[PDB]
Amino acid sequence: GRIAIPGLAGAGNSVLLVSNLNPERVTPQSLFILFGVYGDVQRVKILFNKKENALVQMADGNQAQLAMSHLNGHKLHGKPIRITLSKHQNVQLPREGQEDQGLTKDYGNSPLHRFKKPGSKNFQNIFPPSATLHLSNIPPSVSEEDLKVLFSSNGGVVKGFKFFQKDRKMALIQMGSVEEAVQALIDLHNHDLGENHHLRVSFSKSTI
């Protein structure tokens, strides 16, 4: 019956899926990271050895969408991705089978953000697959040497290395690839600096 216009009103749903997993190469935190940059990931599930899927419960529709829009042939690890949808309400903690190790996890309101909009959706930052990673939070201890020594000890192509808009606390770097600048993120986001001043990292619009 009544379709050829389903949506607007009731549209957006927050709960995603992640499919076309290679087994090995996809992890629970690789996944958190990108959903949690594109949006603000709410809670994170895996189908371990069940489907070659991930259930990734996102911030809302236009969030979820962007992560599916950006991920969709971002070849993270290096399989043609097919992250799609679920609608599925929320996730509340399941199964023996299921939880035991951290197939499940409960990420709720992770405090890293970078958004921290009080009930905004502003969207300036996000930037589709580029090699140039935005770095933040530096106490008066480390420097560009040590931040750059970090994207240099992970394996890295570290193209360039900089300081942000005007102000200058924040830091910017560029690897050679996303394949890398992505991998290097998954490394450095919330990089356990010490006493909860852990590293914040994403994909920048500025340059080198």
Let me know if residue 115 belongs to a domain: no
Domain housing 202: 120-208
Residues 9 and 200: their CA atoms lie apart, in Å, by 35
Do 148 and 45 lie in one domain? The reply is: no
Spatial CA neighbour of 30 closest among 84, 67, 85, 69: 67
Residues 183 and 129: their CA atoms lie apart, in Å, by 12
The sheet with strand 82-85 has its strands ordered as: 53-54, 16-19, 82-85
Residues in the chain: 208
Do 137 and 69 lie in one domain? The reply is: no
Let me know if residue 66 belongs to a domain: yes
Residues 116 and 182: their CA atoms lie apart, in Å, by 22
Do 101 and 27 lie in one domain? The reply is: yes
State the virtual CA torsion across 88, 90, 96, 97 in degrees, nearest 10: 40
Spatial CA neighbour of 107 closest among 46, 41, 55: 41
Using the 3D structure, point to which of 78, 108, 138 is the last residue of a domain: 108
CATH code at position 67: 3.30.70.330
HSE of 159, CA atoms in CB hemisphere, 13 A: 17
Query: Looking up tokens 């006493």, which residue turns up?
Result: 195
Let me know if residue 113 belongs to a domain: no
Decide if 138 contacts 147 (C-beta within 8 A). Answer: yes
Spatial CA neighbour of 164 closest among 123, 113, 205, 127: 205
The 8-class DSSP code of residue 171 comes to E
**Ramachandran assignment for 198, one of left (phi > 0), alpha (psi -120 to 50 degrees), beta (any other):** beta
Quote the tokens at residue 127. Answer: 């930037």
Which amino acid, residue 127?
F
Angle at CA 50, nearest 5°, toward 29 and 189?
Answer: 5
Let me know if residue 114 belongs to a domain: no
Torsions phi, psi for 15 (to 5 deg): -50, 90
Residues 13 and 57: their CA atoms lie apart, in Å, by 9
Number of domains in the chain: 2
The 8-class DSSP code of residue 159 comes to -
State the virtual CA torsion across 33, 38, 40, 45 in degrees, nearest 10: -50
- Helix, strand and coil content of the chain, in percent to the nearest 5, comes to 20, 15, 60
First to last CA, the chain: 55
Do 20 and 61 lie in one domain? The reply is: yes
Do 91 and 174 lie in one domain? The reply is: no
The sheet with strand 200-203 has its strands ordered as: 160-162, 171-174, 132-136, 200-203
Quote the tokens at residue 41. Answer: 């990931």
Do 2 and 93 lie in one domain? The reply is: yes
Residues 80 and 157: their CA atoms lie apart, in Å, by 23
CA 171 to chain centre: 19
Decide if 46 contacts 28 (C-beta within 8 A). Answer: yes
Do 180 and 130 lie in one domain? The reply is: yes
Using the 3D structure, point to which of 55, 76, 108 is the last residue of a domain: 108
Asked how this structure was determined, the answer is NMR
